[PDB]
Nucleic acid binder design. Structure first.
Lengths: 92, 92
DNA sequence: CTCTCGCGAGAG
DNA sequence: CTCTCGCGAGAG
């Protein structure tokens, strides 16, 4: 798995969260994003038995890598929170 | 309320979260930080009746301003999450 | 204390 | 969908 320039070309480049939101929407379905978390961890505040499974970590790192080259002043942990925020955008 | 250089001089300058953690520890008690949130909002996941009151928003903005001048590549919303993380560091 | 990170209400 | 932001387990 490698993100291609034709996928990046279709994404907002003004702000990293806007870039991640578009790029994630290019790569993944709303249903996929609604039912996955970044890491597959159980939430400290979930009483629910069911836990969302993780994203593919190779895909995570490709997304971070592409984002880091467009937004080199953004750190790794910030981009990880941006991915999590986009997944959460798909859960209402 | 104005943060002075003698307060900033005592803080880690390598990373913004480390700078915020030190600066907050210079300004505030552990008990204060344990019992306040950034905004005073009720948590979506709190079943507790009791809600932590907000920080003084003039103090928040002075902290953000000092941080922004040391870490100009850090955005406003990131620094706000860093303040929240330091408050949370004092709650165990 | 410290960091990470899924939750989810509420406002848009 | 989107952002903000307090929670808090678990690992350090």
């Amino acid at each position: 798995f490698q993100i291609e320039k034709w996928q990046i070309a279709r994404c907002n480049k003004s702000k990293p969260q806007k870039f991640i939101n578009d790029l994630m929407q290019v790569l993944y379905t709303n249903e996929y994003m609604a039912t996955h978390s970044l890491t597959g961890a159980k939430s400290s505040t979930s009483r629910d038995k069911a836990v969302k499974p993780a994203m593919n970590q190779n895909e995570v790192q490709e997304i971070i890598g592409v984002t880091k080259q467009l937004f080199p002043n953004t750190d790794d942990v910030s981009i990880r929170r941006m991915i999590g925020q986009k997944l959460n955008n798909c859960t209402k």
